[PDB]
Write a protein that holds these residues in place. Structure first.
Motif, PDB file in Angstrom:
ATOM      1  N   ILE A  32      -9.214   0.414   3.652  1.00  0.00           N
ATOM      2  CA  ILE A  32      -8.680   1.763   3.786  1.00  0.00           C
ATOM      3  C   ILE A  32      -8.662   2.377   2.395  1.00  0.00           C
ATOM      4  N   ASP A  33      -9.426   3.455   2.195  1.00  0.00           N
ATOM      5  CA  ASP A  33      -9.466   4.146   0.904  1.00  0.00           C
ATOM      6  C   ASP A  33      -9.311   5.652   1.109  1.00  0.00           C
ATOM      7  N   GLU A  34      -8.060   6.107   1.207  1.00  0.00           N
ATOM      8  CA  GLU A  34      -7.714   7.520   1.070  1.00  0.00           C
ATOM      9  C   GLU A  34      -8.368   8.390   2.142  1.00  0.00           C
ATOM     10  N   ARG A  35      -9.180   7.784   3.000  1.00  0.00           N
ATOM     11  CA  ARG A  35     -10.016   8.542   3.916  1.00  0.00           C
ATOM     12  C   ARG A  35     -10.040   7.965   5.321  1.00  0.00           C
ATOM     13  N   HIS A  38     -12.395   1.858   6.679  1.00  0.00           N
ATOM     14  CA  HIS A  38     -13.817   1.663   6.461  1.00  0.00           C
ATOM     15  C   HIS A  38     -14.208   0.278   6.953  1.00  0.00           C
ATOM     16  N   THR A 148       0.451   0.931   3.578  1.00  0.00           N
ATOM     17  CA  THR A 148       0.915   2.130   4.262  1.00  0.00           C
ATOM     18  C   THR A 148       2.339   2.467   3.829  1.00  0.00           C
ATOM     19  N   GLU A 151       1.194   4.153  -0.653  1.00  0.00           N
ATOM     20  CA  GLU A 151       0.129   4.891  -1.321  1.00  0.00           C
ATOM     21  C   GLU A 151      -0.311   6.126  -0.550  1.00  0.00           C
ATOM     22  N   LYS A 152      -0.577   5.997   0.748  1.00  0.00           N
ATOM     23  CA  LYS A 152      -1.082   7.103   1.561  1.00  0.00           C
ATOM     24  C   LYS A 152       0.089   7.951   2.039  1.00  0.00           C
ATOM     25  N   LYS A 154      -0.914  10.739   3.089  1.00  0.00           N
ATOM     26  CA  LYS A 154      -1.746  11.324   4.141  1.00  0.00           C
ATOM     27  C   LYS A 154      -1.993  10.327   5.268  1.00  0.00           C
ATOM     28  N   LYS A 157      -4.327  11.214   7.956  1.00  0.00           N
ATOM     29  CA  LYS A 157      -5.739  10.877   7.815  1.00  0.00           C
ATOM     30  C   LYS A 157      -6.035   9.474   8.315  1.00  0.00           C
TER      31      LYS A 157
END
Lengths: 173, 154, 285, 284, 285, 154, 154, 173, 173
Positions: A32-35, A38, A148, A151-152, A154, A157
């Motif tokens: 999981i990278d900011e988006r 993956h 979770t 960092e995020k 968002k 997202k």
């Protein structure tokens, strides 16, 4: 070598207790990278059994179950009903590939008997109801992916995509 | 007769409408919906389809998005407007071919996964180019109307 | 008769000229040039009419009704336009030349074929039978040429051999110095067999790749790469302007068709393409 | 027309800075390659042309072909010396041109870095280029409109980039010089010689004995007369940009690369330069 | 006047120029210079317009609206471009000269052909028909030359004969020793007949060979060697900028074209191969 | 009958390939064909022409073989590779000059020997330079391609 | 009606997609495809064919791989990236020339086997250049479309 | 003189006892050096005869049979049906050359009669199906090049090439 | 069935007596229609042995021989040393194809012994010395092709055609 376990993500919480390993090593291919997530995993001909959700092996090439692949061993309580496999990283239908693979991997699969006792009609189940997405975050996306709520900011997202990034087939039978 | 296609087209458009997120991709899809239907019946189906796939960039991730779009409803085929719209229109054509049984659904969902069979898909389509020019006209013109109506002009 | 006046004219390209044909999928040139029923480039009479009528309409703001009468209104139309253009047949195209059997040097000549002259003869026959305005001069200058079909031929000089557009070899046989030259232009004018004229004329076009650069980093944009297709400057197209009664038409052919010498056809008129010189056969032969 | 070839050597000896050196050498190459013919002909013997010399000189009395063949090598050496001696550096063209170009760039709001480098030992630049290749077999990077040997801007940019790369990673190199997906940020110009002490070109020789030979049995010398760029010549070139954060590396890299080579066969210490002066003119 | 203003200007290369026409197959160099329909160097008006537009967009940032109006919006254009660039005709190019018997030994000399001057006169005629502008000084200076065509001409020198680009021996003859210098530099101006000027100019460019070093073993990479054509410094390209009446066009010609002096054309700017200056004949001649 | 530059290049390269027996000679000829064109542009055709002639080092015996190469198809260029390559390229240029009719065969063959001719040959070349340089380079580009294709890299 | 050229392009891309094992060879063949059709449109066929055989390096090692690709399906083009790109494109062209009966496959294969008859191959091609350039257009455009569709960029 | 032996290499294992020599000399023209086979010979216009597989002379330029050369002489009970011939080492249409040959050599060819009673309709066939490719390493390529498994632990290279490098045309009659 | 015999066309008189049937039937493969020779066969891999010129078998794909195909069987004292073989009318290397073939065919070829005693060094020899063309037209194109001197006064046509269309290689050893 390396051991990874693929964990189904249906709309049921039969996944809470299906692995004992949270990290094990240091790298799960599911990242999981900011988006959003993956390197998501998908397998063919398979549909799940949400009531104590396990992967029933169908044969329908449309039958696909979408989940995340994490390093670990299942509960240290199985392989009497869970499929194990050793695939060299070129036989894995990984979607959202961001980083690469370690050129080999041993995979385990939460399996169930064929249960040859009824027409195995599977049902197209799409992850909706972001309320259930929420608990799904705190159930597995927080136990395993503890990052979770650290960092995020968002998380939407990661809340908006699981409503679409994950759909599968369930038997409902 | 093709009087159910006005409903089939409605379903396919509802899918590809809720599928594109960035509105620019929707306007680009409208552009494609207007542009391609003339070419299909002027230049033939095979040439236009080669053009479509060439502009679609069949990579396994967008292919997976399409596969889910066939079955799911929240599916999000993403990327770039000028490149996701061509994939959306290819999805339109494939949704038709599936739902009218012109091509078998499992074969399609399978050849949209294994690169080798992806070529045999195109071969099949070559063996069904005359059939898929007569059936699909009404469907594509309905998609054209729906595109001009529901997607605001750029 | 049917047509009150008939004004055949030539179209000399001052700069390069690009009249867009309309793209497709199997095109291999993003922006092609309008071809005709046998491959050669032409200007469709619609582009001719629209370009000219849009030129006259602003270079003559006083009599913006004589035009509207001869070339049709743009608002509510209640009558067929009295003026009639015709598809601009390619008359003669320039081409690089490396000549043999002559030290007399030319760096480029004019090239036309027999099929083009046959189409021009068709135009002239129909117009002379439909407007009473005969052109015995030009019609005979073209009959004299067509009497020599099936054999390459030169008019304005003696070459007897040449290599056109670096590829094609021809053995010209001068018709006769007795033919008065069609549009002078100094340089010779070749009339080639058509099977070779096709390749020569194709080779004589101007294909040009263009790019589009991102506006913030000086690098090309994705998809910003195409090709265009011009005809070269000094290309000659031959069209005819036809008119009917209703003396507004008679004015047109006396106040408008005399002050009309330069127009802008085709597109890319910000790349300096399309500047055109009309030269009325009425006063050019 | 042939009188031009017959008189080209006189021409070099007299004009010496205002002949087109490129065309002069390319024209005297015809002499050099038809030597025996230009020799055995009644040239309208001009007491001032260097080719009359080989009529009164006698080598290998008996054989004539070998006599001509040795006269030709002497003539090649004399041509090299001639070019080296007469063609010198006027210099003021370059100063005026660079001043004008600097004013231009200042008008365009460019931070400029005026750089002059002096050649320490005689340098070879663009050996594979074409100037004297037809005679000596090895050229010099020569600009036949400025009529002065020059260092290509591409070459200086490339050496600077290789250094900054090996210093600060390919990532930073591309952040300065740009990769295949974004433009560069530093602009270089060709280097032209402003001032030189005594000469501009000087001859030299290379003589491979055992280059590509199996053994001592097929070995032999093989001398190659060729021009080089004399020591003490001071070339000059500009560097300009706008992203003012790229000057710091260019300041650092410049005095270090020049102590290494800047041209050909630098491994054997030939194209070594000194950073005479760095001047900067900020964009303000 | 179809054109509010006409602004013919010259383009003097400060450094060398590369305005490439992309790699091809029928030609040996890997990055040739933009040729024309005749075979001479040129600068397609698209290249001119793109370079100039980008430049003065980033230079005059306050007047973006005027610039877009006269040159074209970069996105969703609701209207055409009021400004028109014509292709840059090669006016005069340097050449390497070797000549005995001159009062001054020249190192290089400008070189022109009659075809280039014919094209210049054609540009001037066309824009003088399509606008109120008239350039009688240039037209006079040019046809003063064109009258003496059919042979090689030296405008201002005593060069009897010479060898241009070490390959072409030409016998010259002076024109008047009175005609003014259009190229405001005492350097002579040869004007050659074509078919000998075509080569002298094709051969007068600069093909420099470049390489790519294999960073790991410090030799040339495999397949990493190419040539490039530049155009010599001080080459002159004639071109015309045109505009239609808008009251934004007037402002465009009122300060922007009065402050447009130097720009960066073509590619390879980072090799310092772009700088060039514009002259604006209207304030030169 | 007139033959295009590519046809002529093929026709010449054929017999010059069937005349370089040794293979080092072939690879050297390729090395020539790949750079003498850029050299001809940079330094003119007459300087480079006589550079090729000299560097061929004909010695009036290999000159005989070269002359025989026109007449027969069994002739064989003789000498060292670094000389046979230049003799072959010299024949290439001579074949062009003769076939295009720019210079008579008798004149050329009479040059390369009999030193009195060589200078009037220089003058004739200076008369015809605009005729030759027009397209000699596009005739030799085809030779470059053919040599790069049908000859191995040393 | 038929669009047999698209069928032929499909069954040829089938082959060359299964000979370029290394992925970079696929990407580079895609680069060749997106460019050589434009080059053959502009600069004719013979110049582009010369430029293709030159960049292909048709050494007898590769020629065997091509003659095997003709019949076999387990053939694999060997070489660098660009060399096998141009070799695959040469095979594309030769496949079209054989299937459409422009050349006799016996003659072509016998030419590629020998080091000399390749010149006769090129000659016979020269004699057929107009027909070939008129025919091969749609085939090459189809190949271009397939390449930019079924192959990711670099 | 230095005499090499040619051998048919089809999918037919008719090659067990057909020679006399493993090495004979210090060299076979065929080499195997950590990079795959080298100096592979091709013979064109001939086909294999799987029923007692041998080289048959047809007159089609398409029929090519690749094989390997071994310094040897066949079985000292032949020359009644083996094409013996001597060439100056240049007419050898070799594949993947490594060095140079000594400009003289004698070779034998396994010949089978044309038998003009049946149309020799020949068909192309490639060597697939590792089952026959695995053993044929031992069947011939080890019994001859016994350095196999003594130098090459990466047999899969010399396994994957023959899968793709060697082929022939087949009578299938 | 049908019989056709192959006849090489060298510049030597090793062909004079090798044919027994001129036509026998009413057709052939080789034809001559007012423009020269058509439907000519080419045999590769073989060369000539002019001292009793027969197609000596070698392995260079470049050593080829050219000849016409007429019907017949030679002299009934051979084919113990000639190549008899049946092909499906398409596996032949035909020059200037005109029409379809009989989809079956028997072929007879003058075959020589390999004779592995000397280095085969074949030499390419074309047909020159048009006196040879005359004596070969007398050899075959009169004793067989009686249609010549019956329809064709164009002896120069067939002469210039044989001077180019027929070349070959030969050992001369």
């Amino acid at each position: 070598s390396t051991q990874r376990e693929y964990v189904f993500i249906p709309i049921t919480n039969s996944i809470t207790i299906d692995v004992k390993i949270t990290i094990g090593g240091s790298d799960h291919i599911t990242n999981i990278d900011e988006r959003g997530i993956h390197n998501v995993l998908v397998i063919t001909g398979y549909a799940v059994d949400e009531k104590n959700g396990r992967l029933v092996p169908t044969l329908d090439p449309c039958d696909y179950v979408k989940g995340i692949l994490v390093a670990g061993t299942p509960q240290q309580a199985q392989s009497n009903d869970f499929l194990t496999l050793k695939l060299p990283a070129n036989k894995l239908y990984l979607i959202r590939k961001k980083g690469n693979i370690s050129d080999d991997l041993k995979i385990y699969i939460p399996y169930s008997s064929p249960d040859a006792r009824n027409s195995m009609k599977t049902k197209p189940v799409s992850i909706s109801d972001d309320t259930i997405v929420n608990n799904i975050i705190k159930e597995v996306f927080d136990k395993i992916y503890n990052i979770t709520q650290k960092e995020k900011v968002k998380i939407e997202k990661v809340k908006e995509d699981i409503k679409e990034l994950f759909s599968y087939y369930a038997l409902e039978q | 007769l093709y009087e159910e296609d006005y409903k089939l087209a409605l379903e396919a458009f509802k899918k590809v409408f809720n599928a594109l997120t960035h509105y620019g991709a929707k306007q680009a899809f409208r552009s494609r919906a207007r542009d391609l239907v003339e070419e299909i019946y002027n230049s033939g189906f095979i040439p236009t389809f080669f053009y479509i796939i060439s502009k679609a960039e069949l990579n396994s991730d967008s292919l997976d998005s399409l596969i889910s779009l066939f079955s799911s409803d929240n599916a999000i085929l993403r990327g770039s407007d000028e490149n996701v719209s061509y994939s959306a229109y290819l999805f339109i054509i494939l949704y038709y071919l599936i739902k009218r049984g012109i091509i078998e659904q499992k074969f399609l969902i399978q050849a949209l996964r294994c690169e080798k069979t992806r070529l045999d898909l195109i071969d099949k389509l070559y063996n069904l180019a005359p059939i898929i020019s007569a059936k699909i006209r009404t469907y594509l013109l309905a998609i054209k109307r729906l595109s001009e109506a529901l997607i605001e002009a750029r | 008769p049917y047509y009150a006046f008939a004004e055949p004219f030539f179209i000399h390209a001052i700069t390069h000229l690009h009249v867009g044909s309309g793209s497709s999928v199997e095109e291999e040139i993003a922006l092609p040039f309008q071809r005709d029923e046998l491959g050669y480039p032409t200007i469709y009479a619609s582009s001719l009419k629209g370009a000219i009528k849009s030129f006259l309409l602003k270079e003559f703001p006083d009599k913006r009704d004589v035009i509207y009468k001869v070339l049709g209104e743009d608002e509510n139309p209640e009558e067929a336009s009295l003026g009639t253009f015709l598809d601009a047949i390619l008359f003669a195209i320039p081409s690089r030349i490396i000549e043999i059997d002559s030290a007399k040097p030319y760096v480029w000549v004019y090239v036309t074929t027999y099929e083009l002259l046959k189409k021009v003869k068709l135009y002239l026959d129909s117009i002379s039978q439909l407007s009473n305005a005969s052109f015995s001069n030009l019609k005979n200058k073209i009959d004299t040429i067509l009497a020599k079909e099936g054999k390459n031929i030169t008019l304005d000089s003696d070459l007897k051999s040449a290599i056109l557009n670096e590829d094609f070899y021809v053995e010209l046989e001068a018709l006769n110095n007795k033919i008065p030259s069609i549009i002078n232009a100094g340089v010779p004018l070749l009339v080639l067999e058509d099977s070779i004229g096709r390749e020569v004329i194709n080779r004589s076009l101007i294909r040009v790749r263009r790019i589009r650069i991102d506006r913030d980093k000086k690098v090309v944009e994705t998809g910003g790469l195409w090709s265009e297709e011009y005809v070269p400057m000094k290309t000659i197209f031959f069209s005819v302007l036809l008119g009917k009664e209703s003396k507004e038409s008679a004015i047109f052919a006396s106040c408008i068709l005399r002050n009309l010498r330069y127009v802008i056809l085709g597109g890319k008129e910000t790349i300096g393409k399309g500047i055109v010189e009309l030269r009325w056969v009425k006063d050019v032969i | 027309a042939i009188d031009f070839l017959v008189n080209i050597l006189e021409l070099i000896k007299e004009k010496q800075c205002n002949i087109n050196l490129f065309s002069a050498i390319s024209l005297t190459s015809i002499v050099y390659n038809n030597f025996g013919e230009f020799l055995s002909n009644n040239q309208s013997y001009s007491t001032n042309n260097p080719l009359l010399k080989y009529h009164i000189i006698i080598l290998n009395d008996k054989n004539k072909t070998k006599d001509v063949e040795e006269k030709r090598n002497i003539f090649k050496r004399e041509v090299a010396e001639l070019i080296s001696r007469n063609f010198k550096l006027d210099g003021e063209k370059v100063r005026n041109y660079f001043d004008s170009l600097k004013e231009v760039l200042k008008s365009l709001k460019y931070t400029i870095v005026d750089v002059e480098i002096t050649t320490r030992t005689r340098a070879l630049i663009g050996v594979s280029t074409s100037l004297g290749k037809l005679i000596f077999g090895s050229g010099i990077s020569f600009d036949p409109y400025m009529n002065l040997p020059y260092i290509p801007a591409s070459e200086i940019k490339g050496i600077v980039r290789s250094y900054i790369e090996g210093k600060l990673g390919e990532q930073e190199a591309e952040e300065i010089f740009g990769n295949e997906e974004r433009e560069g940020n530093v602009n270089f110009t060709d280097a032209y010689p402003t001032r030189s002490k005594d000469f501009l070109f000087v001859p030299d020789v290379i003589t491979p004995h055992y280059n590509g030979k199996k053994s001592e049995a097929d070995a032999e010398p093989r001398p190659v007369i060729h021009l080089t760029i004399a020591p003490k010549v001071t070339f000059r070139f500009l560097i300009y940009y706008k992203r003012e954060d790229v000057g710091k590396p260019i300041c650092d890299s410049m005095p270090i690369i020049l102590i290494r080579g800047l041209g050909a066969r630098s491994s054997v210490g030939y194209s070594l330069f000194e950073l005479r002066k760095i001047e900067v003119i900020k964009a303000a």
